[PDB]
Design a protein around this ligand. Structure first.
Ligand SMILES: [Ca+2]
Ligand SMILES: [Ca+2]
Ligand SMILES: [Ca+2]
Ligand SMILES: [Ca+2]
Ligand SMILES: [Ca+2]
Ligand SMILES: [Ca+2]
Ligand SMILES: [Cl-]
Ligand SMILES: [Cl-]
Ligand SMILES: [Cl-]
Ligand SMILES: [Cl-]
Ligand SMILES: [Cl-]
Ligand SMILES: [Cl-]
Ligand SMILES: [Cl-]
Ligand SMILES: [Cl-]
Ligand SMILES: [Cl-]
Ligand SMILES: [Cl-]
Ligand SMILES: [Cl-]
Ligand SMILES: [Cl-]
Ligand SMILES: [Cl-]
Ligand SMILES: [Cl-]
Ligand code: NA
Lengths: 551, 551
């Protein structure tokens, strides 16, 4: 196998990083910038014509980077990259390839799985979605009473919801006349509130589930089907109002969906890497196939960069390594993603799944428990909203929180001076985080302002910003389908690199099984009002209190 | 002063906790439950008739609790509680009282500030809001073309946005015919997209800013004013479509608002504790005054519980102490808030400000840098959404993440068996997190599935759940204005308790100043195309790249 299973803690590079942390953990950004006028130039990378990734405000120096790149080499990262792209079954616990990259392979170079090219199958679904979307968007596809579709409701959980919702939100300027809705929670509120806003005669539902047996999704789908049939009566009409993003043709046909409107995907498409497949049909319906292709093309450009660039100028590798420095040496548990863009309000939430479900693992590729930290907690809110909520803690708390600040230079909304104001904050916050403001500086200001020694003693300590809060700044010309594709793929590959180095399996998710099993056991126990005694005292107590509250 | 400044780390209780952690670190939840069938009964509390707080699935035993309550007593928490409620100026760095509790003091017992009872003024603003809301909601208040108002747009940042948005979202079942919208980001997209959805003749804007000079809010307000006037023409009409939540009468009048429609609040109301004041006018407009009074009453109920209950049965104290155990002894950096309720989708975000802006501090009350951890990072998404995104990492990652699971027994929407399915997950997830699943159990399941010995040996470790992931479960009868008030106040007090014990100032926010200062310096530099060289190389580089991109 090209994918190796090297324990990172046993490498010379890791030992060098441990020594370096001991002797340089107090590295100070003000000093790093003061001592090298070319720091920004040396710690930044350009991607294409429209993206700048500035990683200069990180607690790294030439030595740190040298040891980090050495770690990537010593864990045979290049061999792993090759293995993924060529179709090797690197998802070993499920014995599957990992080929979200094939989904956006615009070059159409063959991608073999068991000696057969998967591109014709990929392209056949894409072509089918393009054709279908034109009929729906253009009005030729009629509902059961002869009307054009006005609303699309995507029904799905996790990977079948987060990506499409995030992308359609991020790309609102590119939307067409259709109103798209995303229902995901099994909580009845979600579907109930959506159904109040749509009409059975003009709504198309997409049921997004590979197995077509996902409990939450099928519960929602059946609720929608019931609602639809109250208006339509004849199940034959379901075929004009429901499509499936699935491979279970028998179940799909039984539901009443015409299998011509079943859009397939494959085992090598992980849910959390699936927006690029048939799962992206809601994106195609919202912004059109031209824009969806731009999104795929942007991901493809980043895929090409990731495969072809030496590590020292490879953006996903650099970001992954800097992240490892904080996670495994500085002991930071989290990473904040802070887009200064309201349309990107769901971007951080998307990476909670993409990152945390991939790398939230504790058993290495050899089947041994890890003795080091794996994936971090991802969180964030768009600026300036998050800025006015929780930045107090980032600036003056007791936790190290690496932050990725992301912003476009050009807004889609050319209203007054809002964008210059927004951007002034984008630039100022990272400057503030890095360099702070010292006690000597604050005291000198209070003295010049006529303050007494007593006032100075009482207030200076609270006004000091220690700084050394590291950040990456990613500046994009404009958030377009292509640049969004660039960004999503960039983080996908960052996640991949970290999982390779940490010697874990990034593409399985065995950690979701126990909760599902236990819920299946509890469900029938909630139907009646009888006392439950079959679990531990807490579960019993909670279930019995629930029954008493209900009746 | 009644608020003391006791360093927690030198207390006998903290030293006892340190000694206890030597053995208590490897506590096991399965074992704790097996050792006492009364565990749920002993580690749970009922609040009124409608709330159960179950803290039994925590890594604590009787000794842990004894030492934790000893810590609360040794830091003189009881005195701090009295100090806050009586109006002592506990916000010492700004020399202010902290009296959000007076805003919901339904009992009207006097609360003195500068030797005068503040309750008549609190009640007068409430009465003014009641009267105004009746005119707006009932249709008597007419727009400039004589039509009743149909939409309300709240403009504010931080505390002037997060609470009202969260509460109106949580209480959608109680809404009247008005459509409410919340604009906060200075990013022009936020206001632009909102304005596309409303009509100048039927929209009322609330400009929420105490100073009426907040850059983001006033930029937004002026954009809205310009849009309104493009349709209305005469500035005199502004008075029928704009109101202010502020104390700056001169600026409010200058904007064109009738000061009869300026609703005031006081310096002792912190922004992140302000939804209970005039800042809550959008809540009153969305759900009516009577429901807002229920919200206040629920907070008041919880306030009474907090002040009158011995620590051993005091919910906010118990939650605070368990949080300290994880933050300061187990070293967990974060806390997840996971409401199994789609309406509560903004609840965790609200507490990002309430918690993190309060306790993300590093200097103690005596002006000395802390040598221990203070506030944690708060994050989360509602179940089952979050459940299908990031629980993989909670179950099988390498980070300890205490979780607060919250759910109502009764949904506001009657939708088939959705609620039983939702609740089956709520109960099952905490059961799974606490007790896990052993290798023996996994091996048995794989053997029954017909796996070969080699297949089993290869897969078993990846399917094991170590458990010992602690949670609190808060089960409420139903999320109503009253129970929501109970919950918000509960967490407010938890935050207060933690800040008292950590010897920090929870009610100031000096950490917001540097970013503002630096943004003020950068803003004028973004107006022209000239190269910027006035900062460090990264800030200069980013600004210059920005200028090149917009050219
Ligand atoms: Ca060295
Ligand atoms: Ca740590
Ligand atoms: Ca002991
Ligand atoms: Ca909403
Ligand atoms: Ca004027
Ligand atoms: Ca830690
Ligand atoms: Cl390599
Ligand atoms: Cl496969
Ligand atoms: Cl292709
Ligand atoms: Cl397949
Ligand atoms: Cl289109
Ligand atoms: Cl580590
Ligand atoms: Cl038990
Ligand atoms: Cl134990
Ligand atoms: Cl005051
Ligand atoms: Cl007033
Ligand atoms: Cl009402
Ligand atoms: Cl600590
Ligand atoms: Cl039920
Ligand atoms: Cl065998
Ligand atoms: Na298989």
């Amino acid at each position: 196998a090209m994918l190796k299973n090297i324990n990172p803690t046993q490498t010379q590079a890791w030992k060098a990083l441990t020594a370096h942390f001991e002797s340089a953990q107090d590295m100070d950004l003000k000093a790093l910038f003061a001592q090298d006028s070319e720091r920004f130039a040396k710690y930044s990378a350009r991607f294409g014509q429209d993206i700048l990734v500035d990683y200069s405000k990180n607690l790294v120096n030439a030595e740190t980077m040298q040891h980090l790149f050495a770690l990537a080499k010593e864990t045979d990262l290049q061999s792993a990259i090759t293995a993924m792209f060529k179709g090797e079954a690197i998802n070993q616990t499920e014995d599957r390839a990992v080929l979200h990259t094939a989904l956006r392979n615009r070059s159409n170079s063959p991608v073999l799985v068991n000696g057969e090219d998967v591109m014709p199958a990929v392209n056949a679904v894409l072509a089918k979605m393009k054709a279908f979307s034109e009929r729906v968007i253009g009005g030729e596809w009629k509902g059961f009473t002869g009307k054009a579709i006005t609303d699309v409701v995507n029904i799905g959980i996790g990977g079948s919801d987060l990506g499409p919702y995030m992308v359609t939100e991020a790309l609102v300027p590119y939307k067409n006349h259709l109103t798209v809705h995303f229902v995901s929670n099994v909580d009845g509120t979600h579907m109930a509130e959506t159904l109040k806003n749509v009409d059975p005669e003009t709504t198309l539902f997409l049921v997004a589930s590979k197995t077509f047996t996902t409990q939450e999704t099928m519960t929602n789908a059946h609720t929608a089907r019931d609602w639809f049939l109250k208006a339509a009566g004849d199940e034959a009409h379901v075929a004009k109002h429901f499509a499936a993003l699935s491979t279970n043709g028998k179940a799909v046909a039984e539901f009443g969906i015409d299998t011509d409107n079943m859009f397939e995907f494959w085992d090598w498409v992980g849910g959390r890497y699936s927006l690029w497949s048939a799962i992206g049909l809601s994106i195609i319906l919202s912004i059109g196939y031209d824009n969806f292709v731009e999104l795929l093309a942007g991901a493809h450009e980043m895929d090409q960069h990731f495969v072809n660039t030496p590590f020292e100028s490879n953006i996903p590798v650099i970001l992954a390594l800097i992240g490892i420095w904080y996670n495994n040496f500085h002991g930071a548990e989290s990473e904040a993603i802070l887009p200064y863009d309201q349309y990107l309000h769901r971007f951080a939430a998307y990476f909670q799944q993409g990152n945390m479900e991939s790398n939230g693992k504790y058993v290495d590729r050899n089947g041994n428990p890890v003795t080091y930290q794996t994936g971090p907690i991802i969180w964030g809110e768009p600026g300036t909203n998050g800025q006015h909520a929780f930045y107090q803690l980032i600036h003056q708390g007791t936790k190290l929180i690496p932050c990725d600040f992301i912003a476009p230079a050009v807004s889609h909304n050319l209203v007054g001076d809002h964008h210059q104001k927004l951007m002034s904050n984008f630039f100022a916050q990272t400057e503030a985080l890095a360099f702070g403001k010292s006690a000597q500086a604050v005291q000198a200001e209070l003295e010049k302002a006529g303050k007494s020694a007593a006032e100075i003693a009482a207030l200076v300590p609270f006004k000091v910003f220690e700084g050394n809060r590291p950040t990456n700044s990613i500046l994009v010309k404009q958030i377009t389908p292509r640049t969004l594709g660039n960004l999503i793929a960039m983080y996908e590959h960052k996640i991949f690199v970290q999982g390779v180095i940490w010697n874990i399996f990034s593409f399985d998710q065995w950690g979701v099984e126990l909760g599902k099993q236990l819920a299946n056991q509890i469900l029938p126990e909630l139907a009646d009002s009888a006392a439950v005694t079959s679990h531990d005292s807490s579960t019993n107590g909670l279930i019995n209190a629930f029954k008493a509250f209900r009746a």
